[PDB]
């Protein structure tokens, strides 16, 4: 993913000036992020697998051959509620659901000794060091 | 001592609250920006350790970041729900926060007052003097973001289609469809309210909140600087943006800024001299805009994690934290986007009209202290009866509003009174 | 991962020379007598201790997220373990009801046992009842119908009883509700009281 710029831009035809000398050659699609090079754009929808930009993502399908694809991610599921003047829903059951919650509580206390870092551990270095204030 | 002052009537009333969720996403080009494009220079620098690789990785952490804050407040919901066609929830009128379907982007008309007077640009532009966007040709990049805005105003077409057809069941499990003004009347019981309250004004508070809500578009667009805490964050970012490029013509102590002149100009060894100093200056310059760049994004972040608990708290649910969610008794919320923000409509309910009473602990009645159940007691200056408390609605003090305990003895201020009993009326056949 | 990134770009700026023959300090000792020695270890001398500074600062924006974050960590435990929150999805998606802490290597999981709802069901539902021109809300419940007959169900979920008059409450008569439907509202006094 080159990214921003416009691929009749890019090398208008690769053909060397781009540094990255290395190139691509598969289809070549144009986000609104870049011009994305190496990747096939399909027409689906599906959730978001490489987030690339500009709700575009990328992932990796299988075709037989499984290959790159670069789509936009759809948000999740359509669902429509009856609603009407006069009609409600009720659960009938339940379910017990045990989630879990990660976080971080602290992190690793370290501390540096300031002078056999700086002037290493032997050196009249360290009286110049003390000038530092 | 004993004086009790109750309301009358009341007020619904939208209040909004803007919050950044989200600053703009940059990338440096640490050598670009520092050595200029083309430049043994840059053979000089990387003798400066992995300085470079800090900045990309401190960069890079933010980066992602804006995308999970923006993910967190508005990816909430499973799926997308999406309202009826038949648009009539009761008499309330949610045209102004409902998507529009006239409109290409489907955003709300209040939505549409809020991508106006939030005057920003993407100095990405893929397209080709417009303004300072043009940083983006200094080293400086402008990553886009993840969800762009027909997404994230279409997460939130849905916890809006999701709490106006549900109420908040679709925050807690399936969402379970549930007539609008019956679930405004759990949201009157959830303040303390009864239901008859909510079934008998019906017409005047839809009335009430259909005009209220009209006057947020006021509120918000013809009130200039209304959204003056999204507007700081596209300033600040663009002004740390600018004062790092103009850092790049200062010499910090050489002959020059430009790197190509004293290379064209003095000798390699002379030109080492030089070019260390200004190599010195400009990677200083970068680590101070780094460094604030990490320290604003923890203030994004504290405030992306506030309208991301508003959201489930207000929106997915009704909140008892008082002015947690808009000041008032919270009834419910509605969420706008904003460019780089949520805007969030707060509708509350407000007690008016009040009016003084005489009140008192318990009622003695048969030498026996009756203490209102879930009411009040008070007294239109002559009769006693049992309202409830934030709203006068009087009634006869039965024996079924009011429980017993103990003997008119302890209490400090009973009043002696009649307890109506049901039963000896009814068996006195 | 962040800590000992930042630790190791600490250590392997050691190395780096900043604009000096060579990073040895010992090097340059035993090797260029002191003055044109106290210029190349002044260099080395700004770069290694701009190096610990960016490491401290970087450092305490770090650990200023880590406190936040331990912040949440112990709300999340008074208000999910300690108790029973109401704040919604605060305590895991659903209806909180439990929480139980597991501690880990610098960090604490909770996991969150909570109520959600399933197998609804469509039904007819009513704001009132009007039974003798008085209208009957539902005392703390809501009023349903499998088609033909009403009932009163807690909200959440489907438990019809009967709509007596000690699970449903009077306020005013049926002029004023919008929506209010005609039914009996069965007392058990009359019933008892036809005696």
């Not at chain 1, 790159?68 to 599921?77: E, F, K, N, P, V």
């Not at chain 1, 879990?100 to 009286?127: A, F, H, R």
């Not at chain 2, 009834?331 to 706008?336: E, G, H, K, T």
């Amino acid at each position: 993913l080159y990214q921003g710029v416009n691929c009749t831009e890019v090398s208008v035809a690769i053909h060397a000036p781009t540094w990255r000398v290395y190139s691509t050659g598969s289809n070549v699609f144009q986000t609104r992020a870049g011009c994305l090079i190496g990747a096939e754009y399909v027409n689906n929808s599906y959730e978001c697998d490489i987030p690339i930009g500009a709700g575009v993502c990328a992932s990796y399908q299988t075709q037989a051959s499984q290959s790159i694809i670069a789509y936009t991610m759809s948000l999740g599921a359509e669902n429509s509620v009856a609603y009407s003047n006069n009609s409600i829903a009720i659960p009938t059951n339940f379910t017990i659901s045990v989630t879990t919650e990660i976080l971080p509580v602290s992190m690793t206390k370290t501390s540096v000794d300031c002078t056999m870092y700086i002037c290493g551990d032997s050196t009249e270095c360290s009286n110049l060091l003390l000038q530092y204030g | 001592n004993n004086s009790i002052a109750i309301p009358t009537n009341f007020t619904i009333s939208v209040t909004t609250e803007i919050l950044p969720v989200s600053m703009t996403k940059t990338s440096v080009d640490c050598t670009m920006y520092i050595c200029g494009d083309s430049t043994e220079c840059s053979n000089l620098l990387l003798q400066y350790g992995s300085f470079c690789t800090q900045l990309k990785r401190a960069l890079t952490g933010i980066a992602v970041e804006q995308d999970k804050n923006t993910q967190e407040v508005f990816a909430q919901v499973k799926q997308i729900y999406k309202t009826p066609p038949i648009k009539y929830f009761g008499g309330f009128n949610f045209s102004q926060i409902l998507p529009d379907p006239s409109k290409p982007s489907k955003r709300s008309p209040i939505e549409d007052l809020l991508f106006n007077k939030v005057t920003l640009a993407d100095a990405g532009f893929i397209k080709q003097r417009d303004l300072i966007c043009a940083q983006k040709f200094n080293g400086l990049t402008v990553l886009p973001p993840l969800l762009t805005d027909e997404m994230i105003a279409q997460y939130t077409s849905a916890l809006l289609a999701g709490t106006i057809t549900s109420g908040w069941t679709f925050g807690a499990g399936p969402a379970l469809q549930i007539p609008f003004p019956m679930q405004m009347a759990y949201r009157f019981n959830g303040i303390g309210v009864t239901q008859n309250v909510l079934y008998e004004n019906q017409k005047l508070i839809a009335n009430q909140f259909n005009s209220a809500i009209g006057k947020i578009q006021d509120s918000l667009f013809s009130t200039p600087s209304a959204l003056g805490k999204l507007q700081d964050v596209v300033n600040h970012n663009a002004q740390a943006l600018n004062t790092l490029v103009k850092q790049l013509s200062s010499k910090f102590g050489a002959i020059s800024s430009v790197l190509n002149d004293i290379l064209s100009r003095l000798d390699p060894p002379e030109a080492e001299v030089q070019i260390d100093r200004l190599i010195t200056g400009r990677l200083q310059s970068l680590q101070t805009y780094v460094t604030q760049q990490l320290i604003r994004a923890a203030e994004i972040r504290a405030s992306a994690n506030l309208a991301a608990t508003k959201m489930s708290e207000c929106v997915l649910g009704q909140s008892k934290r008082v002015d947690f969610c808009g000041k008032g008794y919270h009834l419910m919320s509605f969420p706008q986007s904003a460019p780089h923000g949520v805007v969030f409509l707060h509708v509350t309910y407000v007690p008016a009209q009040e009016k003084n009473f005489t009140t008192a602990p318990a009622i003695c009645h048969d030498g026996k202290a009756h203490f209102p159940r879930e009411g009040v007691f008070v007294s239109n200056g002559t009769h006693w009866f049992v309202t409830q408390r934030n709203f006068y609605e009087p009634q006869i003090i039965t024996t079924d509003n009011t429980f017993v305990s103990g003997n008119c003895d302890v209490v400090i201020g009973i009043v002696n009174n009649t307890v109506y009993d049901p039963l000896q009326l009814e068996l006195d056949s």
